[PDB]
Design a protein around this motif. Structure first.
Motif, mmCIF file in Angstrom:
data_model
loop_
_atom_site.group_PDB
_atom_site.id
_atom_site.type_symbol
_atom_site.label_atom_id
_atom_site.label_comp_id
_atom_site.label_asym_id
_atom_site.label_seq_id
_atom_site.Cartn_x
_atom_site.Cartn_y
_atom_site.Cartn_z
ATOM 1 N N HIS A 196 0.839 -1.188 0.000
ATOM 2 C CA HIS A 196 0.000 0.000 0.000
ATOM 3 C C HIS A 196 0.878 1.243 0.000
ATOM 4 C CE1 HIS A 196 0.950 0.579 4.212
ATOM 5 N NE2 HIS A 196 0.185 1.654 4.259
ATOM 6 N N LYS A 197 0.259 2.363 -0.348
ATOM 7 C CA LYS A 197 0.921 3.654 -0.390
ATOM 8 C C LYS A 197 0.429 4.489 0.782
ATOM 9 C CE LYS A 197 -0.319 7.053 -2.953
ATOM 10 N NZ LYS A 197 -1.132 8.288 -2.824
ATOM 11 N N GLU A 198 1.367 4.983 1.576
ATOM 12 C CA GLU A 198 1.095 5.767 2.766
ATOM 13 C C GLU A 198 1.200 7.240 2.402
ATOM 14 O OE1 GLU A 198 2.331 4.449 7.014
ATOM 15 O OE2 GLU A 198 3.802 5.951 6.389
ATOM 16 N N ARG A 199 0.176 8.013 2.770
ATOM 17 C CA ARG A 199 -0.135 9.246 2.048
ATOM 18 C C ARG A 199 0.804 10.398 2.393
ATOM 19 N NH1 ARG A 199 -4.449 11.555 -1.083
ATOM 20 N NH2 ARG A 199 -4.857 13.681 -0.337
ATOM 21 N N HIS A 200 0.742 10.908 3.630
ATOM 22 C CA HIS A 200 1.577 12.011 4.136
ATOM 23 C C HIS A 200 1.448 13.274 3.278
ATOM 24 C CE1 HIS A 200 2.749 8.910 6.669
ATOM 25 N NE2 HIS A 200 3.801 8.464 6.011
ATOM 26 N N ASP A 205 5.483 10.982 0.120
ATOM 27 C CA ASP A 205 4.588 9.835 0.177
ATOM 28 C C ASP A 205 5.419 8.560 0.190
ATOM 29 O OD1 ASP A 205 3.007 12.038 -0.484
ATOM 30 O OD2 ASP A 205 2.630 11.348 -2.520
ATOM 31 N N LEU A 206 5.046 7.602 1.029
ATOM 32 C CA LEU A 206 5.833 6.386 1.185
ATOM 33 C C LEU A 206 5.114 5.221 0.529
ATOM 34 C CD1 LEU A 206 6.945 6.840 4.867
ATOM 35 C CD2 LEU A 206 8.413 6.936 2.873
ATOM 36 N N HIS A 208 5.010 0.898 0.577
ATOM 37 C CA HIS A 208 5.432 -0.335 1.226
ATOM 38 C C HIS A 208 5.436 -1.432 0.177
ATOM 39 C CE1 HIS A 208 4.886 1.169 5.485
ATOM 40 N NE2 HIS A 208 4.313 2.111 4.760
ATOM 41 N N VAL A 218 10.173 -0.187 2.945
ATOM 42 C CA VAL A 218 9.516 1.101 2.764
ATOM 43 C C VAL A 218 10.423 1.989 1.929
ATOM 44 C CG1 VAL A 218 8.355 2.992 3.921
ATOM 45 C CG2 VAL A 218 8.467 0.771 4.998
ATOM 46 N N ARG A 220 10.525 5.851 -0.448
ATOM 47 C CA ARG A 220 9.877 7.076 -0.894
ATOM 48 C C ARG A 220 9.384 6.930 -2.327
ATOM 49 N NH1 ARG A 220 13.085 12.572 1.009
ATOM 50 N NH2 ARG A 220 12.675 12.354 3.250
#
Ligand SMILES: [Mg+2]
Ligand SMILES: [Mg+2]
Ligand SMILES: [Mg+2]
Ligand SMILES: [Mg+2]
Ligand SMILES: [Mg+2]
Ligand SMILES: [Mg+2]
Ligand SMILES: [Mg+2]
Ligand SMILES: [Mg+2]
Ligand SMILES: [Mg+2]
Ligand SMILES: [Mg+2]
Ligand SMILES: [Mg+2]
Ligand SMILES: [Mg+2]
Ligand SMILES: [Mg+2]
Ligand SMILES: [Mg+2]
Ligand SMILES: [Mg+2]
Ligand SMILES: [Mg+2]
Ligand SMILES: [Mg+2]
Ligand SMILES: [Mg+2]
Ligand SMILES: [Mg+2]
Ligand SMILES: [Mg+2]
Ligand SMILES: [Mg+2]
Ligand SMILES: [Mg+2]
Ligand SMILES: [Mg+2]
Ligand SMILES: [Mg+2]
Ligand SMILES: [Mg+2]
Ligand SMILES: [Mg+2]
Ligand SMILES: [Mg+2]
Ligand SMILES: [Mg+2]
Ligand SMILES: [Mg+2]
Ligand SMILES: [Mg+2]
Ligand SMILES: [Mg+2]
Ligand SMILES: [Mg+2]
Ligand SMILES: [Mg+2]
Ligand SMILES: [Mg+2]
Ligand SMILES: [Mg+2]
Ligand SMILES: [Mg+2]
Ligand SMILES: [Mg+2]
Ligand SMILES: [Mg+2]
Ligand SMILES: [Mg+2]
Lengths: 260, 155
Positions: A196-200, A205-206, A208, A218, A220
């Motif tokens: 999944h993509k972690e938003r921030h 954006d990170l 996984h 993980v 960038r």
RNA sequence: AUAGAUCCGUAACUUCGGGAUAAGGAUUGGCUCUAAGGGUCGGGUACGAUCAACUUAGAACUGGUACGGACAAGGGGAAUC
RNA sequence: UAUCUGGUUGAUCCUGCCAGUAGUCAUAUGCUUGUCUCAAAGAUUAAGCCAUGCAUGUCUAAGUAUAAGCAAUUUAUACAGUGAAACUGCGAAUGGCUCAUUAAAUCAGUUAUCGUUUAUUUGAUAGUUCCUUUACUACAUGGUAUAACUGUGGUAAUUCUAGAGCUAAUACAUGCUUAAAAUCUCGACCCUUUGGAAGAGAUGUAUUUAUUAGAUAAAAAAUCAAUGUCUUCGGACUCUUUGAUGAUUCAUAAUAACUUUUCGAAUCGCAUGGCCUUGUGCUGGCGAUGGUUCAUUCAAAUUUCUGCCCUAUCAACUUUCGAUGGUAGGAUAGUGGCCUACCAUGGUUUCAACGGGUAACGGGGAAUAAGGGUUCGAUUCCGGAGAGGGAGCCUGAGAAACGGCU
RNA sequence: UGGCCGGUCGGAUUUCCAACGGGGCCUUUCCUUCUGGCUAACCUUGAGUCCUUGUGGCUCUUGGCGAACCAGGACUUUUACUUUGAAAAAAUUAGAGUGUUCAAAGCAGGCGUAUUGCUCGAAUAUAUUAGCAUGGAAUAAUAGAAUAGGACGUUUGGUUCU
RNA sequence: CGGCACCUUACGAGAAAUCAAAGUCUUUGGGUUCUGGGGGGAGUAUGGUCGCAAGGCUGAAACUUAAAGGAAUUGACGGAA
RNA sequence: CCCGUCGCUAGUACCGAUUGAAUGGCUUAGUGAGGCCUCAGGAUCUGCUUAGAGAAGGGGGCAACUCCAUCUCAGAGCGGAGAAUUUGGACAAACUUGGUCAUUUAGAGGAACUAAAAGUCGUAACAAGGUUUCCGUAGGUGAACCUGCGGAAGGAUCAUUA
């Protein structure tokens, strides 16, 4: 100071060029081009050092001025032309085509592809924007402006460029469950699928990424390059497939391969 | 902030390129431009419905909040539309395996959408250089109670 | 020779009051303006008429760089007995 | 690679330092010196002074060749090979050296440009060129004006140049031909209104201003002011187009104009195909060099957070003459007291401000290694700064450049 | 970690288990929601335990905790600490490989048939503070409901905005 | 319970004299302030500040030096018993 | 054993009249080169042009006040480039005077300290050191010192509920 720099010191070169510390004070500074200076591989480093086809830089110049090499279907007689990621290098004599893809140690590998695969490349969408006279264009990771893209193409997608007429043959979205080629950092060269993509919102954006051996890492989103679906990549992967064996399993491979 | 002399300067204070047409009377009086600053920072209804101008406001002005999002105790509201906040922290000296109290004084532009005083915890956000020393706008004020309701006299 | 006034700046020493106008340095006319600094006059059992004085500060313009334009008006400093 | 020993006493046990001891990519010096590999080296003192010589020039098929240069006969009496000079282009802003300045300054890690410039590279990109169309002046292609050269000179001297005569361009200055429509605006001929039309101009892209669009969580009904596409005038009504960001007055589009009017190929090489009214007619290939804008690359400039040695025998500093802020302008490539004008009286400080010293460039790093530390880092990589000291500027994308100028 | 069919002349296996280390659920259970699809390891289970064992196979299940996450939230107590992960240029330091004849070093090199050449490499770690993301919630602060300007909400009014 | 102290012991501490704190310290961390870094030069010079003064607070360096000192033991000596 | 004054010798700092001197900052004020911007200037060095000889149909035209046209010289027609010079600014080297800070240094002479142990005079301290010593303060003296007042024991008394 005072202007643009034209010399690259040896020991200031990118480490993945694998230039020896001795034998000269300078490194080949890449020209301006499609790829950034520290994320590209000049033709002198590819021909003289990787392929060993030339002993000198004088012989690299002698190779290129006979219009032998061509990067992405165009000849590119510069000695330090920045051939970076995804670039197809065709040597018409010797009848072979290379795709500049990373190995899993973070280095550009000598990867021979076929003439069918040499007819295209992949490009990570850097921006989708409207140009003058209201014409939409898309910009890939190698500086290509491609007019009138598919409206479903967004940033971080991957287009397939045809290298003769530089159009979009098709494209791959950025979704969970699609292959990644990691193009930056200490996880450089690794291949896996997006968990999944972690938003921030606000920055960096990170992503996984999980590979075939279920090792999650993980990274960038600047370093993530989509190359295909779950399995079945749109390019041909290099030898090793971006797995990142640890050093114990690496010496186990070496002792299991050299003993016969 | 619908009062206290918007046109207090020698120039006419207006939002640039916002046009109030006198020939066609608008259904809403004195058309106002606003924006959400982003990052979950709610535009206050005083910013939406006020009459102030403040070209350096993060909601009705021409600045954009981007970069660091800091937090500090207000120590000085003694300027016009600018406050000084104290960003107290702790610096680690590795020899003694110990810390020392430190502080930094950050001058921050404050919009008249926000009413701030000395003691308020404010959230500030980096913008382009506003003045010689100011690179931040107040985007949020985080003192609602402040233990300042029970101090008053009784019978 | 200095000198009026306005602004700046002022040492040793001191009995802490002075030294001190220390020393030292800029400006100054005319004309046209600007801005502050007042008195009396009305309210529901937020503001105007009206009158008047010379002080201060600033600006533009102007001239054979002149202007405390005559008059009037400290020379200063380091020391000793 | 966790170690001690001699010296105070008549002897003792201590505190305590002196001395020993061992390293130094740590310098100098003395004596000695056979071999191999590797190698620092005018930093410390004087960023003091410099004789001389060199260190920045560069030409491919493809900008300009009438050398009165050399060499050769070919579609070649326009040129054709090679080519000094010189013009043009590009580079000279990189490298190299040094550490004098410099104590939140440089610098390091980390951000920001939704606050900007950017040659080159790479990708994309230009049918609109007419002053007021019923006043166009070559596009089978406009102009002069110069170098080199010739010839006449001046000065003792310089990479000094003067007068005269020539001649070029991818130099300089002008200037042109490329649809076919749509949409606006103006508009001599619609009378009984929900009643329109010729034919004229304009619309590329840059610049500047103003205005507009750049939408959007869900559902029905009510008269109307006038209908709106078309009527079976009951009134069916569906559909209008909206990208990106965490965020915008963004991208982009539209309207009215504006502009000592920007760009929109009068350039070069090689190959000479294809068609039929055989005119040296019409088309036509692979490149080179230019060129506007966007993107990219190389950058640059500014910037967030945090981090620096000693000193209080430096406790208050800043604000005259910008010090902190607001508004407006100017300036800039652009933010900004950067500067100006008018206001406000702020801003920093015992959590050490401000000042003083530094025999201080910052860092990666180096020496010593129980652990923690202590000390060094002018020096091969990164960043800064400087060219005897200051200041000012030209050209250029980039310099406040010094093997540029004043 | 193995731990025993030791059947491979003291070397697969594992509810035969113990010690560790995690995540859930229930025990009055502290953490949020609302807009619309993923139709929960389909809450359920027409088809059915044909498969033989027991309990390791319950399926096209009737709308199904549509809850297996995407964007604007009646959506927000702030920190220190610590774990983990991106980043912290190369050279250097530690260190893997490799007979530079050894070694300091260097990133080379090794193997055939030397005839149409084959091939392993150039790892890894540390890089301290600060910034970023993340797990924990002890320790140490911090804030809340006291003249109730307190919470909710299946109530009912009113105002105002979109 | 709180206080001024005292006697015995040495668990412990200390170089010892001795200490119920000078203990709970190489098995080293309850909280905090001040001070010292071999002996002299020297609490001197100078600067600041306080004082009427005397002086008080703050306070170096050059140079010099292999000991100065602390506690105790044995001796010697005492115009000590 | 030790302490001072005085005495020769050497060394090191300190005070010191000299408006001492020197270097380097910073700076008020005065003068102020240069380039850049700007108000002017116009040596020249030019293309077209005439309504006047300009010995030249105003280019479809020598009658509907009408379809871009040159030469001697005067120009009353313009237009461009443009050097010297020059006006005002901002940047501002550099010089002169004054201020202050940091550093270095000459200095007659004075007052100290050390080397330093032996010189002259005395014997202050160590024994109850022959007046117990030592601290603070004040005065006096050739010098160690003495005396007053308060203090201490580091005393020569841990003691007379005798
Ligand atoms: Mg350089
Ligand atoms: Mg290059
Ligand atoms: Mg401002
Ligand atoms: Mg005077
Ligand atoms: Mg006097
Ligand atoms: Mg005047
Ligand atoms: Mg002895
Ligand atoms: Mg020693
Ligand atoms: Mg030999
Ligand atoms: Mg030399
Ligand atoms: Mg030198
Ligand atoms: Mg040139
Ligand atoms: Mg070039
Ligand atoms: Mg403006
Ligand atoms: Mg402004
Ligand atoms: Mg001002
Ligand atoms: Mg220095
Ligand atoms: Mg140690
Ligand atoms: Mg350093
Ligand atoms: Mg260095
Ligand atoms: Mg130096
Ligand atoms: Mg350097
Ligand atoms: Mg320079
Ligand atoms: Mg020199
Ligand atoms: Mg110079
Ligand atoms: Mg250039
Ligand atoms: Mg220079
Ligand atoms: Mg030179
Ligand atoms: Mg240079
Ligand atoms: Mg080795
Ligand atoms: Mg008791
Ligand atoms: Mg001492
Ligand atoms: Mg004292
Ligand atoms: Mg004194
Ligand atoms: Mg003593
Ligand atoms: Mg003793
Ligand atoms: Mg004398
Ligand atoms: Mg005696
Ligand atoms: Mg006595």
């Amino acid at each position: 100071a005072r202007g643009p720099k034209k010399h690259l010191k040896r020991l200031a070169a990118p480490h993945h060029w694998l230039l020896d510390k001795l034998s000269g004070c300078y490194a080949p500074r890449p020209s301006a081009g499609p790829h950034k200076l520290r994320e590209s591989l000049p033709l002198i480093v590819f021909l003289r050092n990787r392929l060993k086809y030339a002993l000198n830089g004088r012989e690299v110049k002698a190779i290129l001025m006979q219009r032998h090499v061509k990067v992405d279907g165009k000849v590119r007689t510069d000695t330090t032309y920045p051939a970076g990621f995804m670039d197809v290098i065709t040597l018409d004599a010797t009848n072979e085509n290379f795709r500049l893809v990373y190995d899993v140690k973070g280095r550009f590998a000598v990867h021979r592809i076929t003439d069918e695969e040499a007819s295209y490349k992949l490009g990570k969408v850097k921006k989708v924007q409207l140009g003058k006279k209201g014409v939409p264009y898309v910009v890939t990771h190698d500086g290509r402006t491609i007019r009138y893209p598919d409206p479903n193409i967004k940033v971080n997608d991957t287009v397939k460029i045809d290298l003769a007429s530089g159009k979009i043959t098709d494209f791959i979205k950025f979704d969970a469950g699609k292959l990644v080629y990691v193009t930056g950092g200490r996880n450089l060269g690794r291949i896996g699928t997006i968990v999944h993509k972690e938003r921030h919102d606000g920055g960096f954006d990170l992503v996984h990424i999980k590979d075939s051996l279920d090792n999650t890492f993980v990274t960038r989103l600047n370093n993530v390059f989509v190359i295909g679906e779950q399995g079945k990549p749109y390019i041909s992967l290099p030898k090793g497939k971006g797995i990142k064996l640890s050093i114990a399993e690496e010496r186990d491979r070496r002792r299991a391969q050299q003993g016969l | 902030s619908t009062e206290l002399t918007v046109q207090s300067e020698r120039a006419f204070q207006k939002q640039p390129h916002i046009f109030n047409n006198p020939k066609v009377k608008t259904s809403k009086r004195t058309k106002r431009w606003y924006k959400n600053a982003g990052l979950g920072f709610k535009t206050p209804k005083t910013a939406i419905e006020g009459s102030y101008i403040d070209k350096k406001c993060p909601f009705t002005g021409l600045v954009s909040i981007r970069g660091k999002i800091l937090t500090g105790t207000v120590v000085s509201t003694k300027m016009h539309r600018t406050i000084v906040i104290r960003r107290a922290y702790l610096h680690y000296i590795p020899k003694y395996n110990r810390y020392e109290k430190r502080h930094k004084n950050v001058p921050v532009h404050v919009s008249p959408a926000f009413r701030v005083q000395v003691g308020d915890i404010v959230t500030v956000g980096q913008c382009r250089p506003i003045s010689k020393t100011v690179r931040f706008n107040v985007v949020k004020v985080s003192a609602a109670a402040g233990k300042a309701n029970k101090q008053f006299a009784k019978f």
